[PDB]
Design a binder for this molecule. Structure first.
Ligand SMILES: COc1ccc2cc([C@H](C)C(=O)O)ccc2c1
Ligand SMILES: COc1ccc2cc([C@H](C)C(=O)O)ccc2c1
Ligand SMILES: COc1ccc2cc([C@H](C)C(=O)O)ccc2c1
Length: 582
């Protein structure tokens, strides 16, 4: 329909944005190459796009976006030498070649943890604002190779606006570190949301993403009609599909478009959008993404009416399954803005399973008329876990809770690799902080949605190199029952203990020197390995091993010759610990 896709997107996005997405795209496809390779790729591509803008007939201007990006990545001399089997993608035709690159996205790339000097940072910034802006896109995007790319350009500006307001202060440090931290959460979170949106389509079909889009949209805009929501849903699903499939130019473009549409139709969508719609382009879509719920309209009928009472349920459903089910989702979501999206989807799935068996039965209506009680039962099911988990969080504090979750997970999925068990248990206990201080009514929803983000990370880390059958099962059985499914696991008897490996339990003076985070991780790693070796260790003993350990580090980090003390106290500690675990 357009002579030249690259021309079209360049015009549409404008140079600056066009360059920032190309970079992000290269940086996600190729997470090792240094910055500088990438800025070369970015400009080559952009020069060429400029030629196509001026003359659309010009050779190459007709190629697809994959073919052009892909053409550019094959010309990397580093490929075979840096990326291994990656350079074999270059031997294929499109679209297999593109598929092949995308399958080498690495969810755990192992990159220097970003230690920033407020000084060096305000330097680099005053020297080159635009290169700074790019550098940040690169570093985030290479570490989060599914990160929502237009939402990333948004963060890059906010980053830049943080230094524009803070480098001209006197105590720059004190202005920066708060704002950086606050932003840097928001970015990890955004990444994990985005990774779960891609994990939907990839493992469960565009229909799962589409359904997410209904739940989210209906909650946010419950005034809007099904017909309208249905429109926004088609557009929102395409943005995310394109986005997850690495088509960032299309992603950005259709997203800007959808914001423009939403604004031009506030009267049929929401009363909360005034403030959003007066913002510039990137900020507009974010504000929208964050806008407040609209008020549930007034005389809505019972849901029982359309979905349980009505004798024609099986008729409407057989006629168009996903559409009818989208309607259930709109109707349920628009009335329960408090609920977790995971929950709404969990309800929709169950209502599906229900019609699925009931419409094949002799009087469907007797079977399905009773379904809402079953749904009431599901929403109430998880409430006691919360309580247990919050009390435990309050008693132990965040860090102790991370430890309890380390033990807990290591017993249920001890075949999981240790890096993954530590990362995930650390995130799981950050849920305590996120959700436990909230008013009770709010807790279950909060938790349900965070645990989905986090359990997805486990599934995604594990599916890379799969080792535990239970995890594979929970990860592939569903998205929306993962939390129940993980919560229903228990330690197992099949597991042979890991042979003692002393190397994993030695400590050196370095331990005193590490940044705090890295110090926690090193101990939580030991803790995991301990449970893999001693999977029956009881909680009182582990309390002993844990006090004894803190006494040990404390003694040794206080000593005149710390090495000597570690050398000596070290083996003492292995010995008691080996002794205490019978
Ligand atoms: C089909 O199941 C899903 C898909 C995507 C989800 C994304 C999210 C994040 C928290 C979101 O921003 O809504 C939560 C639950 C989800 C369930
Ligand atoms: C339009 O109705 C749907 C469609 C797809 C769904 C998928 C899922 C997830 C992926 C699942 O865990 O099976 C949940 C609910 C859904 C409702
Ligand atoms: C802050 O409240 C929480 C924190 C972590 C939790 C982890 C889990 C996992 C699924 C588990 O227990 O297996 C469940 C509930 C949780 C509630």
């Amino acid at each position: 329909t357009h002579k030249s896709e690259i021309a079209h997107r360049f015009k549409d996005l404008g140079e600056e944005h066009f360059k920032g997405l190309v970079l992000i795209a290269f940086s996600q496809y190729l997470q090792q190459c240094p910055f500088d390779e990438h800025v070369k790729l970015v400009n080559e591509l952009t020069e060429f796009a400029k030629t196509c803008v001026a003359d659309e007939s010009h050779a190459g201007c007709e190629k697809s976006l994959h073919t052009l990006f892909g053409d550019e990545l094959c010309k990397v001399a580093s490929l075979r030498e840096t990326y291994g089997d990656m350079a074999d993608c270059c031997e294929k035709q499109e679209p297999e070649r593109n598929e092949c690159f995308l399958s080498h996205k690495d969810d755990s790339p192992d990159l220097p943890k970003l230690k920033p000097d407020p000084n060096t940072l305000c330097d680099e910034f005053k020297a080159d604002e635009k290169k700074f802006w790019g550098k940040y896109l690169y570093e985030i995007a290479r570490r989060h190779p599914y990160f929502y790319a237009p939402e990333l350009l948004y963060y890059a500006n906010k980053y830049n606006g943080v230094f524009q307001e803070c480098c001209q202060a006197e105590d720059k440090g004190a202005c920066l570190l708060p704002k950086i931290e606050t932003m840097r959460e928001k970015v990890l979170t955004s990444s994990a949301r985005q990774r779960l949106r891609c994990a939907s389509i990839q493992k469960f079909g565009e229909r799962a993403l589409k359904a997410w889009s209904v739940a989210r949209l209906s909650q946010k805009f419950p005034k809007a009609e099904f017909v309208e929501v249905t429109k926004l849903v088609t557009d929102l699903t395409k943005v995310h599909k394109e986005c997850c499939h690495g088509d960032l130019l299309e992603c950005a473009d259709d997203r800007a478009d959808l914001a423009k549409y939403i604004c031009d139709n506030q009267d049929t969508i929401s009363s909360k959008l005034k403030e959003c719609c007066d913002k510039p382009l990137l900020e507009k879509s974010h504000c929208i993404a964050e806008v407040e719920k609209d008020a549930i309209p007034e005389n809505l009928p019972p849901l029982t009416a359309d979905f349980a009472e009505d004798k024609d349920v099986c008729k409407n459903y057989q006629e168009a399954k996903d559409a009818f089910l989208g309607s259930f989702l709109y109707e349920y979501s628009r009335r329960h803005p408090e609920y977790a999206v995971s929950v709404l989807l969990r309800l929709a799935k169950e209502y599906e399973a229900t019609l699925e068996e009931c419409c094949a039965k002799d009087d469907p209506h007797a079977c399905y008329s009773t379904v809402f009680d079953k749904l009431k039962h599901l929403v109430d099911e998880p409430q006691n876990l919360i309580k247990q988990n919050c009390d435990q969080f309050e008693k132990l504090g965040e860090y102790g809770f991370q430890n309890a979750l380390i033990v807990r997970y290591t017993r249920k999925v001890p075949q999981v690799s240790t890096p993954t068990l530590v990362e995930v248990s650390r995130s799981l206990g950050k849920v305590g902080t996120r959700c436990c201080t909230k008013p009770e009514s709010e807790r279950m929803p909060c938790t349900e949605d965070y645990l989905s983000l986090i359990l997805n990370r486990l599934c995604v880390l594990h599916e890379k190199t799969p080792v535990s059958e239970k995890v594979t099962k929970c990860c592939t059985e569903s998205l929306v029952n993962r939390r129940p499914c993980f919560s229903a696991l228990t330690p197992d008897e099949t597991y042979v203990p890991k042979a003692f490996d002393e190397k994993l339990f030695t400590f050196h003076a370095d331990i005193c020197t590490l940044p705090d985070t890295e110090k926690q991780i090193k101990k939580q790693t030991a803790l995991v390995e301990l449970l893999k070796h001693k999977p029956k260790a009881t909680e009182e003993q582990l309390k002993t091993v844990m006090e004894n350990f803190v006494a040990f580090v404390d003694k040794c980090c206080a000593a005149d010759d710390k090495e000597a003390c570690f050398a000596v106290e070290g083996p003492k500690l292995v010995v008691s610990t080996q002794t205490a675990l019978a």
